[PDB]
Amino acid sequence: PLESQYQVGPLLGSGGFGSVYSGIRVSDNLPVAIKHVEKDRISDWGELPNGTRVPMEVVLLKKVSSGFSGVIRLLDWFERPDSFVLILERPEPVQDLFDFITERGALQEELARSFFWQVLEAVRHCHNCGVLHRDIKDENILIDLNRGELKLIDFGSGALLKDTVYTDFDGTRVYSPPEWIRYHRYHGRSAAVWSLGILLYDMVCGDIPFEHDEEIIRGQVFFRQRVSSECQHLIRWCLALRPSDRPTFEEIQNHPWMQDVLLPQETAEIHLHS
């Protein structure tokens, strides 16, 4: 019974993902996020071992549930006549990466390296659990400000990870690869690497590199801020036009720019004021 279990606070945000409210679990005063998604707005539907029909987002979240703090944890969910309600963990204080970059501008490379590394660990965890996120971007990354820890949110555009071709997509166009733009065809990991290149450019430059299809297709990267040669190299590698020319996750984390990463707590202390 959702009403007696949770105390609802103010709206945190709304959009393609639904409507998300601040909340508190009444039993232990635990901070939570209460996310409502209309059934009519749900694109595709998933399984669950017991065989009840839930949104794919519920399927994906349960598959990535663990002690690992790099991905948002699904605590509970309810079905209503016209909607599903998802109870998610809530770090406090928290800020999404989009608001963070909007406020601070382009990030120092040490900060970007720490953030980007944690994103890579989170995305590797998802793939490991058979989940493809499909909407990696600044707005879908939360910063636990006290701990310096990032969390992937909004799995509502995701899919079970497969090795065959995807011919469907409903994530964010400006983070989508040229093979999707040109052919409506992409493979999971190499498309994820593309979005990671877009994200990394966004962190160090303070905005995304491409706005229009023609720019995505052309793949020419211009740096508008001063960015180190090693960071530029990594970005341009992730944003290779041919999917098979893109780095693996392993090649990204072994890249010279990625070495000597700060611990999350170190990151909080130096860059988040902690």
CB 231 to Cl ion: min, Å: 29
Near ligand XIY by CB under 6 A: residue from 71, 72, 204, 252: 72
* Contact characters 34-63, ligand XIY, x per CB under 6 A: -x----------------------------
Report whether 217 contacts 181 (CB < 8 A).
Answer: yes
Residue 187 binding: pick among ligand XIY, Cl ion, none (C-beta 5-8 Å cut-off by kind): none
Would you tell me how many other CB atoms lie within 10 Å of the CB of residue 246? Answer: 22
CB 151 to ligand XIY: min, Å: 8
Amino acid at 102: T
Between residue 116 and residue 175, which ones bind ligand XIY under the rule CB under 6 A?
Answer: 142, 153-154
Closer residue to Cl ion, CB minimum distance, 64 or 72:
72
Helices 109-128, 188-205: axis angle to 10 degrees equals: 160
219: left (phi over 0), alpha (psi -120 to 50) or beta: left
Binding region: 12-20, 35, 89, 96
Report whether 125 contacts 93 (CB < 8 A).
Answer: no
Closer residue to ligand XIY, CB minimum distance, 56 or 227:
56
CB 67 to Cl ion: min, Å: 18
What are the catalytic residues? 135
CB 102 to ligand XIY: min, Å: 16
> By CB under 6 A, is residue 12 in contact with ligand XIY?
yes
Which residue of the chain is nearest ligand XIY when measured via CB? 33
CB neighbours of 247 closer than 8 A, spacing ≥ 6? 193, 234, 237, 238, 255
Query: Which of the stretches 40-48, 51-59, 87-95, 253-261 binds ligand XIY when contact is defined by CB under 6 A?
Result: 87-95
Near ligand XIY by CB under 6 A: residue from 6, 23, 33, 247: 33
CB neighbours of 254 closer than 8 A, spacing ≥ 6? none
Near Cl ion by CB under 5 A: residue from 153, 231, 238, 268: 153
Nearest to 138 by CA among 199, 189, 194: 199
Task: Give the interface with Cl ion as residue ranges (CB under 5 A).
Answer: 72, 153-154
Task: Give the interface with ligand XIY as residue ranges (CB under 6 A).
Answer: 12-13, 17, 20, 33, 35, 72, 88, 90, 94, 142, 153-154
